[PDB]
Amino acid sequence: TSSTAVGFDERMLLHSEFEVKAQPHPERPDRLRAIAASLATAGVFPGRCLPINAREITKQELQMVHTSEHVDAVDTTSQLLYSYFTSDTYANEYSARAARLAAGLCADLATDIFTGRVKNGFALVRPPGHHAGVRHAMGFCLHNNAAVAALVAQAAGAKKVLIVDWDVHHGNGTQEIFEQNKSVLYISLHRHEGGNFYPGTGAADEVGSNGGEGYCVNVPWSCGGVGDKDYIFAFQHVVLPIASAFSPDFVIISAGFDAARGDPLGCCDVTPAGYSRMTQMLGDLCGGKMLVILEGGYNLRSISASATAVIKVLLGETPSVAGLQTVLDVLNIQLEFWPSLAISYSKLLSE
């Protein structure tokens, strides 16, 4: 009831690119191995954290998010030697089961957390999810785990779900899924560089559409490598004020760790202290009840320390000019939708 659960299963290590290559793919089984070994050594998991049984998600639960076409396509890759949905998104014959285990782990953690069987949880899962849209696998992602968790939670009775995506890349897949949706609030912080950073989506004025306006909040950095001070600042002035006004029943963190110091893809500078602080800050919205789902993150040392710092928080254990400009531009846009941001607006204006 007050415990932290970790969702993990070794069959997700079977998803990998087919052979060794001149340029090996950064999304690789060692990511989970390195985190799992560092949680073992710390006594965090196994140990202080509870395991949950790993279940393959059902097609019916996936179709709350994805078309039946996309689910069948992913499943059928199990009969091919290897395949690519896009140039950067691979599958082997074991990838469909891995993806069903990642989504099933997220689904069950989301149910367990929201209905109060456990306090909070970390889905230590592969492949990542937040670039998978309604009908397209891309950006290393096969099914959108975070969006599945949100809809499993809603189905269990959550009216308002918040997703915070601190992966260094914009969650184009998640935003597409909840574009016209206002029972889910999507907040993403990500490198953008005027749209030159992959995937080039998620400009600050991409606020949702057609009745969902205001419920997609993009905080897009104009450069790297952004450090802790800019994330905490954006959390104090954008994330927390909007999240508090929205008042969610359920909180999902899309925790990519590719914004960490040392990541070869993100080239940003967030420390474990930064991830720790952001986790604590989000805890005060739902009294420490939250589902943390692994997305990106590619330096084994960096993601091991950052994931350990985050799970320890689950257990209860002055910005740059670029950062100011991003927050300023976000509040200019979101003020029309979140009037309570005026208070934060006047505090920002005082530098």
Active site residue 25: no
Q: CA dist 201 to 88, 192, 311, Å?
A: 17, 8, 30
Within the chain, strands assigned E span 4-7, 50-51, 82-86, 89-92, 120-123, 161-165, 184-191, 216-221, 250-255, 291-294
Nearest alpha-carbon partner for 270 in 224, 322, 312:
224
What is the footprint of K ion within residues 283-322 (CB under 5 A)? none
Candidate ranges 73-81, 153-161, 177-185, 229-237; the one touching its own copies (CB under 8 A) = 73-81
Select the residue interacting with Zn ion from 61, 165, 230, 258 (CB under 5 A): 258
Q: Does 56 bind its own copies (CB under 8 A)?
A: no
Select the residue interacting with K ion from 15, 70, 100, 190 (CB under 5 A): 190
**Annotated binding residue 70:** no
Provide the b/e sequence for 52-64 (b: ≥16 CB within 10 Å).
Answer: bebebbeeebbee
Distance CA 92, CA 37 (A): 25
For residue 231 the two structure tokens come to: 């994330």
Residue with the CB atom nearest Zn ion in the bound state:
296
The residue count for binding K ion (CB under 5 A) is: 4
Candidate ranges 61-69, 82-90, 213-221, 255-263; the one touching Zn ion (CB under 5 A) = 255-263
Q: Which of 130, 131, 136, 237 is catalytic?
A: 131
Provide the b/e sequence for 294-332 (b: ≥16 CB within 10 Å).
Answer: bbbbbbbebbbbbbbbbbbbbbeeebeeebbebbebbbe
What is the footprint of K ion within residues 156-185 (CB under 5 A)? 165, 167
SS3 (DSSP) at 344: helix
Candidate ranges 12-20, 41-49, 215-223, 277-285; the one touching its own copies (CB under 8 A) = 12-20
- Per-position x/- string for 25-64, each x denoting binding to Zn ion as judged by CB under 5 A, each - no binding: ----------------------------------------
> Which residues belong to the active site?
131
Q: What are the residues binding its own copies (CB under 8 A)? A: 14, 18-24, 26, 69, 72-73, 76-77, 79-88, 131, 133, 136, 138-140, 169, 172-173, 176, 195-201, 264-265
Q: What are the residues binding Zn ion (CB under 5 A)? A: 167, 169, 256, 258, 296
